[PDB]
């Protein structure tokens, strides 16, 4: 690809520069180039990859929701045409990320496996947000479910990756799978079991875990 001629270390370096500059499309391209080098990603490098594509698709999703809302309000073809254009671009990015996960990253340490399986569920979920669909939802559920099984066996309840996986799998249940009670149960059980495990909250993971715990409580407050 376009990044084939650049050193892996230089791609990682420029991904951090792009992050500081809030150039997330560049950031994602650099990290894709790094994945293409064929070596496994470190903990920090996985974070760079996830943050880059999370922000890229985040902007596309937000734009899609604005256009879809306008489209539904109208019950010419321009609104549909432009919404489909943003939708196609969004799907393309999701396909790019899913391709990286399945071709390179998903294979190992439970921390990395759960990380990538959460991503797989997330980007199938984003595909499901715009799908008009059952296959996509099933693929998201499988990834989330496998990640849940591993994290339950291999990771403590306060681990931020385990917490974030549960937060998103709960959101999946609520607004994708039309299972509000399952979403609520999962969020509550996750929050409660993490609250009883704070004695093992490890200095460099305290801020991430407590942040996600508050996001879990945010959703419970919204849904109950």
């Amino acid at each position: 690809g376009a990044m084939g001629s650049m050193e892996r270390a230089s791609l990682i370096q420029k991904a951090k520069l792009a992050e500081q500059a809030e150039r997330y499309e560049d950031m994602a391209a650099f990290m894709k180039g790094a994945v293409e080098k064929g070596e496994e990603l470190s903990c920090e490098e996985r974070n760079l990859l996830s943050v880059a594509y999370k922000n890229v698709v985040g902007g596309q999703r937000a734009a899609w929701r604005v256009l879809s809302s306008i489209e539904q309000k109208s019950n010419g073809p321009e609104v549909r045409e432009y919404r489909e254009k943003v939708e196609t671009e969004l799907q393309g990015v999701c396909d790019t990320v899913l391709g990286l996960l399945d071709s390179h990253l998903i294979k190992g340490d439970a921390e990395s496996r759960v990380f990538y399986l959460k991503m797989k569920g997330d980007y199938y979920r984003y595909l499901a947000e715009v799908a008009t669909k059952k296959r996509i939802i099933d693929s998201a559920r499988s990834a989330y479910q496998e990640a849940m099984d591993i994290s339950k066996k291999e990771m403590p309840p306060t681990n931020p990756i385990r917490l974030g996986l549960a937060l998103n799998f709960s959101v999946f249940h609520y607004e994708i799978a039309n299972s509000p009670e399952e979403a609520i149960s999962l969020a509550k059980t996750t929050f409660d079991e993490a609250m009883a495990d704070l004695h093992t909250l490890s200095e460099d993971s305290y801020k991430d875990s407590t942040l996600i715990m508050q996001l879990l409580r945010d959703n419970l407050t919204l849904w109950t």
Binding site: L167, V171, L211, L215, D218, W223
Partner: peptide, 5 residues
């Protein structure tokens, strides 16, 4: 809007 991470 509900939270994800």
């Amino acid at each position: 809007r509900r939270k994800s991470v």
